[PDB]
């Protein structure tokens, strides 16, 4: 809250999850999946006691998914469905969530980098015409991550549910020519896990079963460390088989899949994506920077996003980077490798770094009038008010 | 108490200090950095300004600009900042209580020193000031009064003979081939190995490689043969990121340009021939003492084995009976400034100072009247 | 009767032909495609790698890799395949019966020429070969002996000033910025509309969009306002699967990186300043002839509006009394090959080959002495 009583809300609006709260807070006040469901009848499910409205949104639309057809309003960071997104935002600022009068509040929104501009333009238009907010700012995600960590230099590897992006920043100066954006994240990993499980005889073909497979990938799956050793474990031993109880009651068994579904981040060719993994992409991003910044970029690799919470992802990333550095910088001199100093900063609450950075930035800039895009500027200019941020649109 | 500051302000590296000391107090690479990327975060420091070691540190995101080029101040909006920084941030002293002894290479645009005096007397409000030639300082820093000062900074090289304190302007020689030209030639020849340096930031890396591993040959062709035949003449350097590169034949090819400017396409004579010619322009009754007291100076004559090479060259050119001795003090890198501080501690130089009212009564042109 | 082969092998496109013709016999992209699926219809023409045109017609299921990046051959196994396809499949002639005139960019590592010669003499077993600077053949073909060649190929852009046939190697400039960087920058700026091209088989679609729609604006700060005010500048393109894209503003922002490389995050100056600096590096006497004989060449200079903008730039940069004439013929997409065919057919050239006997006497280290 600023000196005018106008609450300063911070809303992350992720492809796979909304994390909303107030400025200066230390934890997101509400974290709920971003999906909108509509009631349907199914010949295999029977419920007759829980009141199901004609439109469930967010948390209740996920816990009650057995009796709904759910769909995400976002995808790859690009809003595919605008009506469902407006419903999700009505629910976010509604009574059974953050309860605010949007006529007298400021909001801090985010957006991935290298995203179509019509998306941000329409989001600002919606925020100024539908909810009629008194102030809107659209910050960069890596900048917010470096705000939350408390740094001014580092290469943010932000891998959310919808999209992975690597953004380096040096001494506070953004290098926008090194921003890389790989389109593999939690959702593609979930789809790959669905494929692998279908190889075992389980069929998850409905809209609700996607959340079941998501909750499986979150509990069981993990990123391997020495993929040859993990394959030897999966092919020779039987210590990787683990059982999971679906909501209906069925018991499925997940084995080698545990380390094959999240491997599609380091070996994209498994899911028919022609490129390089997140480790090789990080190394190429670094080695594309000037010589005088590489040595500091190697020491401040900041992980963020939920999809980097796989057990053993920091260590595997570090091992991959060390191998790449040994082969392609030292050209094979093992003696010098012990001098190479990486530091993959994986904070414990790295699943909400963007929100914490937004909270810090809003707590800093709540009481200014040259930072926020004011509603009057919108009514006067239109979608040109975005030029305040540094993104030039006419 | 009250003393006289000394600000060399040579190209490449600006030196400054107080008169009486045996070493310049504040020495820093005279550059100005400017951010070429748009800052986005709150908390970051200054913008549009980075001077000296501060700019050198953060050169990874800046474009660097030397305000001095070949001895001529090209951009005064940056030289003013350089002076402001060396006054208020490095020496940490107000400039309105101390005389200042600046240096200028011979044969320079008059407007250069005119604007120098105008800025010294109009912005920092110094009480007095003085501008001297670097050579006269170098010889006054060797304690000698009869010798031919061969100075070579980063942007200028000049041979100035002096006999019994009298300077001979008719024989002053100035070649423009200097340190930064050698740095550029090194950047160009390093491409043969496959090492590409094209950024003004990586120019610093190349310069450090040069002043760390490059050495001038005694016999160029023989060294070339030995380098082409064996690998016992290849050194290794480590870039900032951690990579290791190898430089062999380039090590002596880079400084050899000082003796064969044709390598840079500059159709002129080398520095040893420049010394020989500046000597042969002096009177016949004094050439032997000049042959005996050749003194070197500047950060471009510290290459290993340059004194012997210059001696061999001059002896080959000079007559046989004339004896050649290359006085190469192993402190020449700051010698001129040492000369500066020395010229600032003489009761004979406390009246040659261009007073403030002296500037007011006649304007900036007085520098030509008082200073030579 | 034996006639030399002129084989360009620049980055992006390889153009081969016989010496003494007016056009290259065979032009094809210098790519190598590795199949990235495992096909089981065995016996239907399966291969391990498709070279040249055969890769493009299959690029949907292949990973296309360029063996030459920025003028440097980063993969020699692939380059041997390119040369074998050129010799035995496009030209259909044994290499052991004709001399081969290859071309190279200036300021490339010496290992490039060394390995070019070693491959042409130990694998293809040619009786003679030569290696020529491309910007010199681009002047041979123009019917001149004095001018500054501005050759901008797919992967590298270099400027060479020549006067009366005497090249000035101290003013040859190079800039690693060409079609491949403009195509990777268009791939980025296309995301602002919503179009996401990422696969190496879609870099070709983006290169086609760029070479069919993009142009160079005469005034960028005015054409931006024009494309902002009205939709009278948009153009639509039809992808090979049906979808239609439309690009209005990207059209001139793609080639504008040539004149403002900061768009790509590069310190270096644009192509107009690259040419102007390379002119002002020469002597005061020959600058007037270099101004009025500015040649263009290479595919990247095949942009509608490149000559007008280049003239508007180098005229606002050159003295007010110098006449600038941008020599830009429509046959400049292959001027280097025509120059090669002219040079290889001359009689006075028949002594400048590197004979197989010469290579047997001194190994691959000979190409540095013979080839300029």
């Amino acid at each position: 809250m600023d000196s005018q009583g106008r609450k300063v809300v911070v809303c992350d609006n992720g492809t796979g999850f909304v994390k909303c709260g107030y400025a200066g807070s230390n934890f997101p006040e509400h974290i709920f999946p971003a999906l909108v469901g509509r009631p349907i009848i199914r010949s295999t499910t029977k419920v007759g006691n829980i009141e199901i409205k004609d439109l469930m949104v967010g948390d209740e639309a996920s816990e009650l998914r057995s009796m709904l057809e759910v769909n995400y309003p976002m995808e790859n960071g690009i809003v595919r469905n605008w009506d469902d997104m407006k419903h999700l935002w009505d629910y976010t600022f509604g009574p059974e969530k953050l309860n605010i009068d949007t006529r007298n509040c400021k909001i801090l929104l985010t957006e991935p980098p290298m995203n179509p501009t019509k998306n941000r333009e329409k989001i600002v238009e919606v925020m100024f015409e539908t909810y009629q907010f008194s102030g809107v700012y659209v910050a960069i995600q890596a900048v917010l991550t470096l705000y939350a960590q408390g740094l001014l230099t580092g290469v943010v590897v932000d891998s959310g549910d919808g999209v992975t992006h690597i953004c380096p920043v040096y001494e506070g100066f953004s290098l926008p020519h090194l921003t890389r954006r790989l389109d593999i994240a939690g959702r593609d990993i979930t789809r790959y896990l669905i494929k692998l499980l279908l190889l075992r005889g389980y069929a998850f073909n409905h809209s609700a079963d996607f959340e079941t497979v998501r909750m499986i990938k979150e509990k069981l799956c993990y990123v391997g460390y020495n993929i040859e050793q993990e394959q030897k474990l999966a092919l020779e031993t039987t210590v990787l088989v683990e059982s999971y109880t679906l909501p209906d009651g069925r018991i499925i068994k997940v084995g080698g899949e545990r380390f094959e579904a999240p491997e599609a981040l380091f070996q994209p060719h498994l899911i028919n994506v022609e490129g390089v993994g997140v480790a090789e992409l990080l190394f190429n991003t670094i080695q594309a920077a000037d010589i005088d910044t590489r040595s500091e970029f190697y020491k401040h690799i900041v992980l963020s996003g939920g999809s980097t919470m796989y057990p053993g992802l920091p260590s595997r990333l570090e091992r991959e980077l060390k191998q790449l550095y040994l082969e392609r910088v030292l050209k094979g001199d093992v003696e010098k490798l012990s001098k190479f100093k990486i530091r993959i900063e994986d904070p414990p609450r790295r699943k909400h770094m963007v929100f914490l950075g937004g909270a810090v930035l809003a707590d800093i800039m709540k009481d200014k009038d040259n930072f926020w895009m004011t509603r009057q500027e919108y009514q006067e200019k239109g979608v040109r008010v975005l030029e305040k941020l540094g993104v030039t649109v006419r | 108490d009250i003393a006289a500051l000394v600000v060399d302000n040579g190209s490449g590296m600006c030196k400054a200090g107080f008169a009486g000391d045996d070493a310049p107090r504040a020495v820093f690479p005279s550059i100005v950095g400017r951010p070429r990327h748009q800052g986005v975060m709150v908390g970051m420091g200054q913008k549009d300004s980075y001077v000296g070691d501060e700019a050198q540190s953060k050169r990874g995101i800046l474009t660097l600009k030397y305000p001095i080029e070949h001895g001529i101040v090209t951009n005064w909006d940056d030289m003013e900042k350089i002076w402001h920084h060396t006054f208020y941030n490095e020496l940490r002293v107000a400039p309105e209580e101390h005389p200042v002894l600046l240096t200028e290479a011979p044969l320079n645009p008059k407007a250069n020193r005119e604007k120098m005096t105008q800025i010294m007397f109009e912005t920092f409000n110094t009480p007095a000031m003085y501008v001297a030639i670097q050579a006269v300082l170098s010889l006054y820093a060797s304690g000698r009064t009869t010798g031919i000062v061969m100075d070579s900074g980063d942007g200028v090289t000049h041979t100035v003979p002096i006999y019994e304190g009298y300077a001979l302007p008719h024989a002053i020689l100035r070649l423009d081939l200097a340190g930064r030209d050698l740095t550029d030639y090194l950047m160009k020849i390093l491409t043969e190995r496959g090492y590409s340096f094209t950024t003004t930031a990586e120019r610093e890396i190349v310069r450090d490689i040069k002043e760390k591993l490059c050495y001038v040959a005694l016999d160029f062709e023989q060294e070339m043969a030995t380098a082409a035949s064996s690998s016992s003449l290849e050194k290794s350097y480590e870039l900032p990121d951690g990579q290791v590169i190898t430089i062999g034949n380039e090590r002596f090819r880079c400084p050899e340009a000082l003796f064969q400017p044709s390598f840079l396409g500059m159709e002129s004579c080398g520095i040893h021939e420049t010394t020989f010619n500046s000597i042969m322009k002096c009177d016949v009754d004094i050439r032997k003492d000049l042959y005996a007291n050749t003194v070197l100076s500047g950060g471009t004559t510290m290459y290993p084995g340059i004194a012997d090479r210059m001696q061999k060259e001059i002896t080959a050119l000079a007559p046989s009976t004339m004896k050649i001795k290359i006085i190469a003090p192993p402190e020449r890198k700051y010698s001129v400034w040492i000369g500066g501080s020395i010229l600032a501690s003489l009761s004979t130089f406390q009246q040659m100072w261009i007073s403030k009212q002296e500037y007011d009564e006649s304007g900036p042109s007085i520098v030509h009247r008082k200073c030579f | 009767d034996i006639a030399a082969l002129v084989v360009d092998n620049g980055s992006g496109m390889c153009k081969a032909g016989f010496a003494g013709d007016d056009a290259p016999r065979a032009v094809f992209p210098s790519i190598v495609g590795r199949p990235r699926h495992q096909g089981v219809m065995v016996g239907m023409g399966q291969k391990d790698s498709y070279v040249g045109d055969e890769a493009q017609s299959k690029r949907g299921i292949l990973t296309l890799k360029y063996p030459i990046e920025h003028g440097i051959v980063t993969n020699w196994d692939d380059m041997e395949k390119i040369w074998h396809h050129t010799f035995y499949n496009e030209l259909r002639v044994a290499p052991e019966e004709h001399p081969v005139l290859l071309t190279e960019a200036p300021l490339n590592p010496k290992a490039n020429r060394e390995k070019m010669t070693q491959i042409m003499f130990e694998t293809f077993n040619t009786p003679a070969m030569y290696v020529a600077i491309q910007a010199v053949l681009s002047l041979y073909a123009s019917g001149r002996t004095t001018g500054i060649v501005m050759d901008s190929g797919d992967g590298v852009t270099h400027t060479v000033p020549i006067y009366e046939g005497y090249a000035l190697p101290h003013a040859i400039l190079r800039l690693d910025l060409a079609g491949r960087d403009l195509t990777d920058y268009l791939m980025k700026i296309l995301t602002e509309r919503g179009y996401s091209f990422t696969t190496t088989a879609e870099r070709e679609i983006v290169r086609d969009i760029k070479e069919k729609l993009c142009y160079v604006a005469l005034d960028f700060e005015q054409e931006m306002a024009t494309a902002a005010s009205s939709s009278s500048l948009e153009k639509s393109y039809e992808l090979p699967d049906g979808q239609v894209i439309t690009i209005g503003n990207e059209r001139f922002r793609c080639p504008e990186a040539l004149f403002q490389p900061s768009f790509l995050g590069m310190e270096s100056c644009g192509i107009h300043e690259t040419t102007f600096n390379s002119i002002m590096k020469c002597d005061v006497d020959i600058r007037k002839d270099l101004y009025a004989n500015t040649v263009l060449s290479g595919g990247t200079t095949m942009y509608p509006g490149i000559a007008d903008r280049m003239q508007k730039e180098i005229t606002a940069l050159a003295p007010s009394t110098m006449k600038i004439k941008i020599i830009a013929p429509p046959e400049r997409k292959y001027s280097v090959w025509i120059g090669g065919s002219i040079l290889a057919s001359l009689s006075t050239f028949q002594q400048m080959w590197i004979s197989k006997q010469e290579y047997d006497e001194s190994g691959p280290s000979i190409v540095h002495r013979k080839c300029f």
Binding site: Q287 | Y195, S196 | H70, I72, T74, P109, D176
Partner: peptide, 7 residues
């Protein structure tokens, strides 16, 4: 390249 730029 080996140092500076990729190639």
């Amino acid at each position: 390249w080996x140092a500076x730029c990729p190639a």
